[PDB]
Structures are given as structure tokens and as C-alpha cells.
Amino acid sequence: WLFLIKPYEGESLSHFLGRFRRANHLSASGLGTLAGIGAIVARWERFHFNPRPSQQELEAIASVVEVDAQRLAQMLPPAGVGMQHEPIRLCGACYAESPCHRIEWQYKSVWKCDRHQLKILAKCPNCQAPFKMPALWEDGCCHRCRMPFAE
């Protein structure tokens, strides 16, 4: 049984699950593995966040494993629109100010943060290690060189 995180309607599914783990005291990858063990569906992914039979799984999870049911399905892109296949770029100001990732970062055309009017970044400066918040967390700290990501 998981404790529900503060909902934001603009949150990415990936972030939503990451915040569930942080709040519930485990790792994101650990959450995915544990979620799969609880469900025993066998098609549940650790990192591919948005599958079609997984929509059925998400509905089930939303309705049973939380204290209060959260909107999971709403966060999920189905086919989605203009979906990035490559690493997801992010806004450093957004992570730091509101520890959440926006769904907008997953789609092409949106290359500048609409709130801070700065270009979205894909790689950590100097380090040049590609920085994907779904893998490297919402804390905005680079994996190789543990330097906070800068704009």
C-alpha cells in the first residue's frame, strides 16, 4: 500500500511513479520491480512507462494499491503526440522549483520552457553526460559527475 503523492495535472507518468517511490521510501527501479511482483501480470516494465496492456495494469493499481486513488491513466500518453524516442530533455528551473517533470518535455516542438523561457537541456554542461530525469531522478543531479545540472 502506497501513500498518494500531491497530484499535479501536468506531471509526467514517469515523474509520478518516481515521486511515489521517493515518498514511500524506495528507488524508482525498485518500485517498478516491486509493482511487477505485486501484480504478476508478466508484461510490466521497469523503464518503458507507457504500454497498452499496462493501461489495464495502471487502472488496477490506481484502484487497489493506494490509500486514495490517484489519476494515473490521465498522466499516461497512449500513442501520445510527437513523442521523443531519444532521451527526454528537461528544465532545471522546473525540477528545482517544483520537484516534478512536465509531460510537455516528452514532445517535440516544445524546445523552450514556456514558464522560464529558456532552452530545455539534454546534457550536463562540461561533463557532457546526457541527463534524463526519468533515469537520473528529479533532483537534477548528474549521474557521472554528481554536479547539479545547470542551465
Partner: protein, 257 residues
């Protein structure tokens, strides 16, 4: 069938109020307020497991809000050669959380998270001797880091285990010595036992000296034996079509011990 209804009842168990049980409850209540580490020791079969169970019953969890239940007291009994993954699992299940697959270290944090939020003012670990020595480190950590008092209930053998580790010995020095019954306390207990525990159609008058000397020799002051001797004698008596326990039945049962 009336006979089977009474046998199905008699073979069961219940809690009888006793001076020793009230004494423990008042003592634990002091340690709870002070958050003080303590130790409970005594001989086998003497009113202890029931007393600890009765205490949990006395102060049941409170669930007046949308947040997790406010569980004040946790009671667990570790399995044989209990290791550090097993102690954490049983504490977590008691508080009604499911344990996910993982290692002890990640599990160290989930146990702390659920020990917090709920009050968990006291932790009673019955049969403390059945624990791997390495696990006493995780018990001290809980007692040290969180405002939680740990009772560590057990038999005489526990003291032989405790004295093997300086840091454990010093922490749990305060103790209550649970004991057995003798004198008037035993006679009054037999009168109470007959009155509450036994509801036989016709009174047996077990307080009488002629049969009390038999119950005394058979029981030797252990509340566990008094319950066996009288509970079996009641079933054996009813099974013969008797409405009470005959002296002959008490003698016949006592001879088996």
C-alpha cells in the same frame, strides 16, 4: 448436544484477572511514559504471555482519522534463530503494511518509516532469547534513535544470553521478576477459577482442604498447571455424565503428572 457444547467451550482459553497481571500492567505503564528500557523475566507457565496479550488489549489502536492507525503498543514473538530480515518483516506486518521484495538495508528504512507516523510508544519482544546475537544491534538502534521503550520479555535463560554483550546488558538493567503463586493467593485463585473459568451445573467446592491439598501438590504454584488439571478434570467428569468434578477425578488426573 449440551455435552459437546460444554466440551467445545472447556477446551478453549480465556484471560482471568489476577494480582500479578495488574502489577505488570501498572509497571509497564510507568516505563511507557518514561520511554525507559526494561526487562521482564520469570519461570515457565506462570501468567506472562497472557499478561502481555492482556496489556495490548488494554490500550488498543486508535483510528479516528484518514491517516494510518495510531498504534501505541507493538507485540511480536520472533521465530527460532531470528535474523535481522525476519525481525523487521514481523514488525512491519503487525502494523498492517505489506513487505515488498528487497534486502535488509532498504528494509531498515521502511520499518523506521512505519514505526514513525503511528505512535509506537512501546515494543514488546517476547521470547527474546530466540534471536541471533547480531540482531540485538538493530533492537538497540530502534531503542536509541526513536522515542520507543523495548520490554524484552523472557525466561531465566535470557539472562545468560544478555550477559554475553556489554552494550545490551547495560541498556536493559531494570527488571520485573514475574513469579508463581503460594499461600492464600493460591486458595483465592482456585475460588476465582471455579467461579469464572468453570460453569459446571453443580459446584465442586474446590476451595475445600481435602481437595485443595491435591490441587496444591499437583500444581506447585504454576498457574499453567492449575488450568490444565482443572480444565481436563472438567471435560473428563462431564464425559462420565457427572455435573461436578469428583475428588476421584482430581486424583486420577494428578497421577498422570
Amino acid at each position: 448436544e449440551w455435552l459437546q457444547a460444554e466440551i467445545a467451550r472447556l477446551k478453549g482459553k480465556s484471560i482471568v484477572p489476577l494480582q500479578q497481571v495488574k502489577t505488570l500492567h501498572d509497571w509497564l505503564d510507568g516505563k511507557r511514559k518514561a520511554r525507559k528500557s526494561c526487562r521482564v523475566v520469570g519461570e515457565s507457565r506462570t501468567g506472562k504471555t497472557v499478561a502481555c496479550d492482556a496489556y495490548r488489549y488494554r490500550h488498543k489502536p486508535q483510528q479516528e482519522a484518514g491517516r494510518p492507525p495510531t498504534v501505541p503498543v507493538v507485540y511480536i514473538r520472533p521465530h527460532q534463530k531470528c535474523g535481522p530480515k525476519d525481525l523487521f518483516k514481523k514488525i512491519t506486518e503487525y502494523l498492517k503494511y505489506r513487505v515488498t521484495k528487497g534486502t535488509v538495508s532498504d528494509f531498515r528504512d521502511r520499518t523506521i518509516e512505519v514505526l514513525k507516523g503511528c505512535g509506537v510508544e512501546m515494543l514488546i519482544i517476547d521470547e527474546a532469547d530466540r534471536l541471533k546475537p547480531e540482531t540485538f544491534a538493530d533492537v538497540r538502534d530502534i531503542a536509541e534513535d526513536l522515542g520507543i521503550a523495548v520490554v524484552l520479555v523472557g525466561t531465566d535463560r535470557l539472562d545468560a544470553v544478555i550477559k554475553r554483550d556489554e552494550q545490551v546488558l547495560e541498556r536493559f538493567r531494570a527488571h520485573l521478576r514475574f513469579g508463581k503463586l503460594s499461600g492464600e493467593d493460591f486458595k483465592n485463585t482456585v475460588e476465582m477459577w471455579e467461579q469464572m473459568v468453570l460453569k459446571l451445573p453443580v459446584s465442586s467446592n474446590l476451595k475445600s482442604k481435602e481437595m485443595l491439598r491435591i490441587l496444591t501438590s499437583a500444581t506447585e504454584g504454576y498457574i499453567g498447571r492449575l488450568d490444565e488439571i482443572l480444565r481436563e478434570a472438567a471435560i473428563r467428569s462431564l464425559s462420565r455424565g457427572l455435573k461436578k468434578i469428583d475428588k476421584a477425578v482430581l486424583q486420577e488426573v494428578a497421577k498422570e503428572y
